[PDB]
Design an enzyme around this catalytic site. Sequence first.
Site, mmCIF file in Angstrom:
data_model
loop_
_atom_site.group_PDB
_atom_site.id
_atom_site.type_symbol
_atom_site.label_atom_id
_atom_site.label_comp_id
_atom_site.label_asym_id
_atom_site.label_seq_id
_atom_site.Cartn_x
_atom_site.Cartn_y
_atom_site.Cartn_z
ATOM 1 N N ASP A 1 -1.870 2.770 -8.522
ATOM 2 C CA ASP A 1 -1.689 2.087 -7.254
ATOM 3 C C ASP A 1 -0.486 1.153 -7.373
ATOM 4 O OD1 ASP A 1 -2.188 1.410 -4.611
ATOM 5 O OD2 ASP A 1 -3.917 0.143 -5.050
ATOM 6 N N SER B 1 -3.630 -7.345 -1.184
ATOM 7 C CA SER B 1 -3.177 -6.142 -1.899
ATOM 8 C C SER B 1 -1.664 -6.074 -1.997
ATOM 9 C CB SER B 1 -3.687 -4.875 -1.225
ATOM 10 O OG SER B 1 -5.079 -4.733 -1.438
ATOM 11 N N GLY C 1 -5.878 -8.001 2.433
ATOM 12 C CA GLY C 1 -4.592 -8.587 2.824
ATOM 13 C C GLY C 1 -3.791 -9.133 1.649
ATOM 14 N N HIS D 1 -1.419 2.119 -1.986
ATOM 15 C CA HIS D 1 -2.466 2.230 -0.947
ATOM 16 C C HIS D 1 -2.099 1.502 0.350
ATOM 17 C CE1 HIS D 1 -4.475 -1.729 -2.064
ATOM 18 N NE2 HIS D 1 -4.612 -1.731 -0.751
#
Lengths: 245, 14
Positions: free
Chosen positions: A97, A198, A196, A46
Amino acid sequence: IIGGEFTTIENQPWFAAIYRRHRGGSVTYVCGGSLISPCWVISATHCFIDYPKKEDYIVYLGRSRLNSNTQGEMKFEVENLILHKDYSADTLAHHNDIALLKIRSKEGRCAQPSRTIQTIALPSMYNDPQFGTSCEITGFGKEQSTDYLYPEQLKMTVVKLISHRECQQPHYYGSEVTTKMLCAADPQWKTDSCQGDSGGPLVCSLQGRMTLTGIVSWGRGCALKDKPGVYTRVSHFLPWIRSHT
Amino acid sequence: GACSARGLENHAAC
């Protein structure tokens, strides 16, 4: 990271800081990642899906600060950007993801291990810690949900693994959480990953070894009651990782 | 909102 503590790269030397160049040349922070071998960083799809051009990105290793250089750091271009073909998102959940960045410097070199740059071990397949186990999360993400800025100094905190059965309750996330995800949270909901963070590592001790158990993926808000952090469950993607590396 | 959350970093709409 909401709550927790400030840290430096020596305490998480596999941590990769990923930035994007803009038309005009300014460079801004995108996401975290984890160094799993000298030439390979693992992150979240993502983070890149809206701008999937590998030439847009810069990866630093050995970096403890967001917008200033750390002594001993290395800067890399992205030779290959591999996103998961079965990625999907709804309003909340991000499925599959996971992403791989093959890194290469201007000189044609990969990561050189040092006191500030080391790899992190992958788990063995379908082997995760039991629920209630304490694990670490690291990143440059927001310190509060309402913050505009990211912290300039790297942070880390501790969260506890939540069972799938608990995370699938309606008051938590219902069916938005799958068996390829892991939930983790603080018992008081006072510390968490946030925007931030991720792509960064959820690290647990398994069989007496520091292990990349999760990748920061999604959540509703941050450090919010009944809303855990949700992490890509690395132990369910080992064939995908091995084939693409 | 959604754009202040984990999941929408480096997104065009945000």
